[PDB]
Amino acid sequence: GVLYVGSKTKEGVVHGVATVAEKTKEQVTNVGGAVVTGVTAVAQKTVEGAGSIAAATGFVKKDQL
Amino acid sequence: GVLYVGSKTKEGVVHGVATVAEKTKEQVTNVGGAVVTGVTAVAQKTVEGAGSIAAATGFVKKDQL
Amino acid sequence: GVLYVGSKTKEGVVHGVATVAEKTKEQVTNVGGAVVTGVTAVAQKTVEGAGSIAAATGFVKKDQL
Amino acid sequence: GVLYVGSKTKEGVVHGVATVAEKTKEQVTNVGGAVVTGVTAVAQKTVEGAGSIAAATGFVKKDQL
Amino acid sequence: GVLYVGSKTKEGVVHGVATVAEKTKEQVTNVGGAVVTGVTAVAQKTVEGAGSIAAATGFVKKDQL
Amino acid sequence: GVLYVGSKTKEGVVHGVATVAEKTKEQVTNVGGAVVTGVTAVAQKTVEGAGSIAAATGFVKKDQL
Amino acid sequence: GVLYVGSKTKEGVVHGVATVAEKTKEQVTNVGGAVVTGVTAVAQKTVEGAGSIAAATGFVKKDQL
Amino acid sequence: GVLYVGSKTKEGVVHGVATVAEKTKEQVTNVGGAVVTGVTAVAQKTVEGAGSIAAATGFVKKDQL
Amino acid sequence: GVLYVGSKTKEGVVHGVATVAEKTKEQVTNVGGAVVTGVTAVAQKTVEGAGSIAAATGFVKKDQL
Amino acid sequence: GVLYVGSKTKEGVVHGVATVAEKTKEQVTNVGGAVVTGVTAVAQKTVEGAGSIAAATGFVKKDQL
Amino acid sequence: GVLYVGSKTKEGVVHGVATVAEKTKEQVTNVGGAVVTGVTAVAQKTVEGAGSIAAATGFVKKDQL
Amino acid sequence: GVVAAAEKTKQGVAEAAGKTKEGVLYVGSKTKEGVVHGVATVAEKTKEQVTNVGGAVVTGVTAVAQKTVEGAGSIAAATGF
Amino acid sequence: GVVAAAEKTKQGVAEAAGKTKEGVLYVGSKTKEGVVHGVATVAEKTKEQVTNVGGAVVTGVTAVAQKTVEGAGSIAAATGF
Amino acid sequence: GVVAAAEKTKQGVAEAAGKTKEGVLYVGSKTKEGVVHGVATVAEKTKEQVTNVGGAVVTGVTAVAQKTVEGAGSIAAATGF
Amino acid sequence: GVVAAAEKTKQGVAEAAGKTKEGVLYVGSKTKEGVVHGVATVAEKTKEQVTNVGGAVVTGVTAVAQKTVEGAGSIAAATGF
Amino acid sequence: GVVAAAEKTKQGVAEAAGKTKEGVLYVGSKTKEGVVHGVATVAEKTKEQVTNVGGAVVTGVTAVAQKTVEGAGSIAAATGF
Amino acid sequence: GVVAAAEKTKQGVAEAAGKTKEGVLYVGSKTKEGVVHGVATVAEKTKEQVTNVGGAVVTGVTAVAQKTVEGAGSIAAATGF
Amino acid sequence: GVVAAAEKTKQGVAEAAGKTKEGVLYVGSKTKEGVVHGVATVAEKTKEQVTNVGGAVVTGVTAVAQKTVEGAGSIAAATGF
Amino acid sequence: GVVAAAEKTKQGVAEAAGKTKEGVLYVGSKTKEGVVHGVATVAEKTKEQVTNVGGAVVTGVTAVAQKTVEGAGSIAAATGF
Amino acid sequence: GVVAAAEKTKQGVAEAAGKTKEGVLYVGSKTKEGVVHGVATVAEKTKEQVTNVGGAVVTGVTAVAQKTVEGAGSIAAATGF
Amino acid sequence: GVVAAAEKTKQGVAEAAGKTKEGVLYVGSKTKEGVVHGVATVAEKTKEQVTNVGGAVVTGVTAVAQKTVEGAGSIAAATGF
Amino acid sequence: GVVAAAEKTKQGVAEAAGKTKEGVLYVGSKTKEGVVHGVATVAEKTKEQVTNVGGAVVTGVTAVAQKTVEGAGSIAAATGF
């Protein structure tokens, strides 16, 4: 007996990201690491699993077992 | 007997992120680490799992077991 | 017998983040650590799981078991 | 017998964050730690789980068991 | 027999955070610790779990069991 | 028989935080500790769990069992 | 038989915090402790749990069992 | 007895990302690490699996078992 | 008894990504690492599998078993 | 008893990516690594398989077993 | 009893990618690595198989067993 | 006097221009003028009656993109002398 | 006097231009003028009656992209003297 | 006197321009003028009657993008002398 | 006298410009003029009657983006002498 | 006399400009003029009657974005001599 | 005499400008002029009657963004001589 | 005489400007002019009657953003000679 | 004579400016002019009657953002000679 | 003679300015002019009657943000000669 | 003669300015002009009658933010000759 | 002759200024001009009658923020010759 007349739904949504860079100097030297200087939009609905990285930006993982 | 007439719903939503950089000097030297200097929008609805990083930005993980 | 006529709902939402940087000098030297100097918007609805980091920004994790 | 006519609801919402930096000098040297100098907006609705960090910004975790 | 006609509700909401920095010098040297000098807005509705940090900013955790 | 016509409700809300810093010199040297010099707005509705830190800012935790 | 016509309610709300710093010199040296020199607004509605810190700012915890 | 008349649904969607760079100098030297300076939009609906990275940007993974 | 009359559905969709670069100098030297400076739009609906990277951008993986 | 009259469906779709580069100098020297400076749109519906990279852009994989 | 009258369906589709480069200087020297500076649109519906790369762009794979 | 020069290089480009006027670029843009999109309707019984005498009647789903220069533009026009 | 020069190079390009005027570029653009798109309808019984005497009647799903210069543009026009 | 120069380089670019005028760029932009989008309707019984005598009637879902220069623009016009 | 120079570099760029005038950039922008969006309706019985004599009647869901220069713009116009 | 110079560098950029005038940038912006959005309605019985004689009547959900220069703009106009 | 210089550097940038005039930037901005948004309604029985003689009547949900230069702007206008 | 210089550096930037005039920045801003937002209504029985003779009547939910230069702006206007 | 200099540094920036004029910044600001927001109503029976003869009547929920330069601005105007 | 200098530093910044004029900053500000917000009403029976002859009547929930320069501003105006 | 200098430092900043004029800052401020907020009402029976002849009547919940320069501002105006 | 200097420091800042004029700062401030806030009312029976002949009547909940320069400001004005 359910009805959907014109309904909307947003689950795990990235919407409307605006970015402007004008005349920006930028100098990076990197040795064995992560350097992030840009736009990163991640939209997910379901992430299941033990010990799992669902969204990583600028990540360094060096584990011993 | 449910009815949805024009209804809206937002669950786990990133909406309307604006960023401007003008004439910004920026100098990074990095050795084995994480340096983040940008925009990062993450939208998720469900993340399940033991010991899981759902959203990491500028993360250094060096564990011993 | 439920009715939704024009209803709205926001659960776990990041909305309207504005950031401006103008002529900002910035110098970073980093050795094995996390340095975050940018925008990070995270929207989540459900995060379940034992010992899980739901949202990390500038995180250093070095554990021994 | 419930009715929602034009109703609104905000649960776990970050709304309207504005930040301006103009001509701000900033110098960081970091060794094995967390330094955060940016905007971080986190919106969550439900976080369940024993011993879990729901929102960390500038976090250093070095535990022995 | 419940009716919601134009009702509003805010549960766990961060709304309207404004920050301006103009010509602010800032120098940080950090060794194995947490230094936070930025905006951090966290909105949560429910956090359950024994021994869990619901919102940490500038946190140093070094425990022995 | 309940009716909500134009009602409002705020439970666990941070609203309207304004901060301005102009020409403020600031020098920090930190060794293994927490130094916080920024804005931090935290809004939560429910936090349950034994021995859990619901909101920490500038926290140093070094416990022995 | 309850009616809410235009009613308001604020439970656990932080509203209208304004802070200005102009030309303020500030020098911090910190060794293994917590130093807080910024704005921190925390709004919570319910915090339950034995031995739990509901809101900590500039906290040093070094316990032996 | 379900009906969908004009309904919409967005689950795991990245929508409307705009980025402009004008006259921006950028210099990168990188040795064995990850440097990201561009736009990255990721939309996913379901990611299941133990120990799996659902979305990585600027990731360095060097593990020993 | 289900009916879909004019309904829409978006599951794992990347929509409307715009990027402009004008007169941007860019110099990269890279030795054995990943440097990403372009647009990357990834849309996926289902990714299952243990220890699988669902979306990697600027990834360095050097593991020992 | 299902009917689809004018319905739409998008599952794993990349739609509407626009990119313009005008007068952009770009110099790359690369030794044994991955450098990506272009547009890459990937749309997938199902990816199953243990230890499989579903979408890689700027990837360096050098594993020992 | 199913009917499809004018229905549409898109599963694993890349649609509408536009790219313009005008007067862009570009110089690449590459030794044993992958350099990608062009458009790459990949649309797939099903990819199954253990340890298989479903979509690689700018990939370097040098494994020892 | 626009002069460009590269010397003793392994990959050199020397570009010079005297006077430039760039044009318009439409890259992925969209435009809609007089468009009807997405009209869903579920009715058990439908009835539509029009009784017109000496006039102009326009019904149904109509989209019009009409341009005129030296004349009267209209959608439904009735004129009598 | 536009001059470009490359010397002692392994891959040299020397480009010079005196005067340039770029044009228009339509790359992937779309345009719609008077378009009807996506009209779904589910009706058990449909009935449509038109009774017209000496007039102009336009019904149904119609899309018109009409351009006129020195004349009266219309969709349905009725005129009597 | 615009002069650019690169020397003793491994990857050199030397760009010089005298006078520049960039143009317009539409990159992913959208425009809507007179658009109807998303009209859902669920009715058990529908009835629509129009009785027009010597006039102009416009009903239904209509979208009009109308431009005129030296004439009277309208949607429904009735004139009698 | 605009002069740029790079020397003894491994990756050098030398850019010089004399006079510049940038243009407009529309990157992901949207514009709506006379738009109807999202009109949901659930009715058990619907009835619509129009009885027009010598006049102009406009009903239903209408969106108009109308531009005129030297003429009278209107949506429904009735004039008698 | 604008001069830029880089020397003995591993990654050098030397940029010089004499006179600059930047333009407008619309990056992700939105604009709405005469827009109706989100009109939900649930009615068991609906009835709408219009009885017009020699006048102009505009009803329903209408959005108008109307621009005029040297003429009278209106939505419903009735004039008699 | 604007001069910039970098020497003996591993990553040097030397930028010089003589005269600059930045423009406007619209980054994520929104604008609404004459907009109706979110009109919910639940009625068991609805009845709407209009009886117009020689005048102008505008009802329903209407949004108008109207600009005029040398003419009388209005929404409903009735004039008699 | 604006001079900037960096020497013996590992990451140097040398920026010089002679004269600067920054512009306007709209970053995430919003503007509303003549907007109706959020009109909820629950009525069991609704009745609306309009009886207009030779005048101008505007009812319902209306939002108008009206600009005029050399003309009389109004919403409902009635004039008789 | 504005001079900036950095020497013997590992991360140096040398910035010099001669004359500066910053502009306006709208970052997250909001503006409302003539706005109706949040009008809830619960009525069992509603009745609205308008009987207008030769005048101007404006009722309902209306929001107007009206600007005029050389003309009389009004919402409801009635004039007789 | 503005001079700045940094020497023998590991992270040096040398900033010099000759003359500065900062502008306006709107960061998170709000403005309301002619706004109606939050009008709740619960009535069992509602009745509204307007009987207007040759005058101007404005009722209901109205918000007006009206600006005029060389004309008479009003909300309801009635004038007779 | 403004001079700043830092020497033999590990994190040095050397800032010099000659003449400064800061501007206005609106950070989180609010402004209300002609605003109605929060009008709750519970009535079992409501009746409102207006009988207007040749005059101007304004009733209901109205908020007006009206600015005039060289004209008579008013809310309800009646004038007879 | 403003001089600042730091030497042999691990974190040094050297700031010098010649002439300064700070501006205005609005940080979290609020302003209200002509505002009605919080009008609660519980009535079993309500009756409101207005009988106006040739005059100006303003009733109900009204808030006005009115500014005039060279004209007569008023809320209700009646004038006869």
Author numbering:
A (entry chain R), B (entry chain P), C (entry chain N), D (entry chain L), E (entry chain Z), F (entry chain V), ...: 36 to 100
L (entry chain E), M (entry chain I), N (entry chain G), O (entry chain S), P (entry chain Q), Q (entry chain O), ...: 14 to 94
Authors' account:
Multiple system atrophy (MSA) is a progressive neurodegenerative disease characterized by accumulation of α‐synuclein cross‐β amyloid filaments in the brain. Previous structural studies of these filaments by cryo‐electron microscopy (cryo‐EM) revealed three discrete folds distinct from α‐synuclein filaments associated with other neurodegenerative diseases. The 3.3‐Å resolution structure of the Type I2 filament reveals a fold consisting of two asymmetric protofilaments, one of which adopts a novel structure that is chimeric between two previously reported protofilaments.
Here, we use cryo‐EM to identify a novel, low‐populated MSA filament subtype (designated Type I2) in addition to a predominant class comprising MSA Type II2 filaments.
